[PDB]
Enzyme design. Structure first.
Site, mmCIF file in Angstrom:
data_model
loop_
_atom_site.group_PDB
_atom_site.id
_atom_site.type_symbol
_atom_site.label_atom_id
_atom_site.label_comp_id
_atom_site.label_asym_id
_atom_site.label_seq_id
_atom_site.Cartn_x
_atom_site.Cartn_y
_atom_site.Cartn_z
ATOM 1 N N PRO C 6 64.023 47.164 70.254
ATOM 2 C CA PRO C 6 63.180 46.029 70.645
ATOM 3 C C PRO C 6 63.975 44.794 71.064
ATOM 4 O O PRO C 6 63.782 43.695 70.533
ATOM 5 C CB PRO C 6 62.366 45.768 69.377
ATOM 6 C CG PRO C 6 63.324 46.108 68.273
ATOM 7 C CD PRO C 6 64.244 47.200 68.797
ATOM 8 N N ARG C 7 64.877 44.964 72.025
ATOM 9 C CA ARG C 7 65.693 43.866 72.529
ATOM 10 C C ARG C 7 66.263 44.280 73.881
ATOM 11 O O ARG C 7 65.863 45.298 74.457
ATOM 12 C CB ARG C 7 66.795 43.495 71.530
ATOM 13 C CG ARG C 7 67.536 44.692 70.963
ATOM 14 C CD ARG C 7 68.915 44.308 70.464
ATOM 15 N NE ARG C 7 69.720 45.485 70.166
ATOM 16 C CZ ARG C 7 70.801 45.844 70.844
ATOM 17 N NH1 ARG C 7 71.239 45.137 71.872
ATOM 18 N NH2 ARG C 7 71.458 46.944 70.483
#
Lengths: 95, 95, 95
Positions: C6-7
């Protein structure tokens, strides 16, 4: 139809950014006796996409006329990132 | 393709030609005057040679016979004009 | 389906070279409360064209293990031209 320049200019890179076709290497291969068939340069897959522009950095002073200024370079910091291309590069301490 | 190519020009166009030639696996030869011994394109080529007399650096690049003799001595097969200098002089093509 | 990161990684530039869509600026505008409609990011004009690849340069020595080596940089010469992008740049004399 002002005229026809039979050479390559300093702005070809601009088209190189839209048609993504190499000019100098293709020129050299053409001088070796190759046609535009093994090179893949045929006119049904050539389509521009995006826009581009080019600028040139000189030593001309916009204050006193536009004459060049000579000296020794005491600091150089370049740039880059997404959608940036640089051609020609000096070094620190150059004259 | 060509075994070796000589570039009779100066600046970023010479470096572009050198990069294109290296991409194609072709050797490169460079020529420089005495007053321009500190240019970058001299150290970007496989071999470099000095042309012209001790004066008139600009006139050194405009000497067809000397460049042809240097190319013959270095065993080159092609000459790349670039832009400017003798890029549109028919004497170079005739020679 | 090993997992979901999630980045943003260090390889996003690769897709930035095929889909020519800005990631960080779009992320910042999304955090400001914009949808993917005024941004023009809708799924009928997104098509890759060309190939790309990325590599990273480190101080690891492939001779003694792969441990990093520390020192002062005594010479730096970069590169560039057609189809080359550089991210991150040190300077001469850095530690």
């Amino acid at each position: 139809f002002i005229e026809m320049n039979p050479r390559v200019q300093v702005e070809h890179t601009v088209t190189e950014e839209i048609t993504d076709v190499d000019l100098v290497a293709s020129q050299l291969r053409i001088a070796a006796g190759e046609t535009l068939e093994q090179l893949g340069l045929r006119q049904e897959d050539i389509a521009p996409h995006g826009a581009a522009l080019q600028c040139r950095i000189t030593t001309e002073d916009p204050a006193n006329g536009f004459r060049p200024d000579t000296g020794r370079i005491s600091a150089l910091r370049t740039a880059g990132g997404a959608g940036v291309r640089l051609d020609g590069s000096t070094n620190l301490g150059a004259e | 393709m060509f075994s070796k190519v000589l570039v009779a020009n100066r600046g970023e166009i010479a470096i572009r030609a050198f990069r294109a030639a290296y991409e194609l696996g072709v050797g490169t030869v460079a020529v420089y005057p005495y007053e321009d011994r500190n240019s970058q394109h001299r150290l970007k080529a496989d071999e470099s040679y000095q042309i012209g007399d001790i004066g008139h650096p600009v006139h050194a690049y405009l000497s067809v016979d000397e460049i042809v003799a240097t190319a013959r001595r270095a065993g080159a097969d092609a000459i790349y004009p670039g832009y400017g200098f003798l890029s549109e002089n028919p004497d170079l093509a005739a020679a």
